[PDB]
Amino acid sequence: DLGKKLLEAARAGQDDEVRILMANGADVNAKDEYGLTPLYLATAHGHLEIVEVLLKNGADVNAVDAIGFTPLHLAAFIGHLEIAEVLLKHGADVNAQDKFGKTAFDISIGNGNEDLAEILQ
């Protein structure tokens, strides 16, 4: 029950909701309909403060999606500089590879995201 609400809150940028669910013992690493976690979804949707909270409550910073994208991969794909930096400060595996051998850096260059690439060098 609580896990579905957390996943949604992470998609929708509902930080007050994320906070109250964590406060009521919601699974910070709950997997959704497709095996994705709150942290990944918050990254996908650019919700910085939410990734901050999820991390402080022990979200798995290197959790992996269908093709082995970690949240850092996704941040690099999209162009989320700040979220990516937060991810780094909290133990994002800077060398992790997806099922194609691509690292976050690879992907930042693929998607023309210069500043991202620049903090992953």
């Binding site: 994705l36 994208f69 794909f77 162009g79 995201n113």
Partner: protein, 70 residues
């Protein structure tokens, strides 16, 4: 615009994990995946605009391209 561009429209996010057509992002632009890319549910759908850049194919494969008719 300080968020993302979809054409000239300024948008909060791109369609990387949901929504149709699915999108890749390049220098803060939301751009469409090739129409032969199969929309993915546990990851992005593509890496660029072309048919050899899909994660999986909507129809027939013909390495390295996803195509409508073999």
């Amino acid at each position: 615009c300080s968020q993302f561009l979809r054409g000239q429209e300024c948008v909060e996010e791109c369609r990387v994990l949901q929504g149709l057509p699915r999108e890749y992002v390049n220098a803060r632009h939301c751009l469409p995946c090739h129409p032969e890319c199969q929309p993915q549910d546990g990851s992005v759908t593509c890496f660029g605009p072309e048919a050899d850049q899909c994660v999986a194919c909507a129809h027939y494969k013909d390495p390295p391209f996803c195509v409508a008719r073999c």
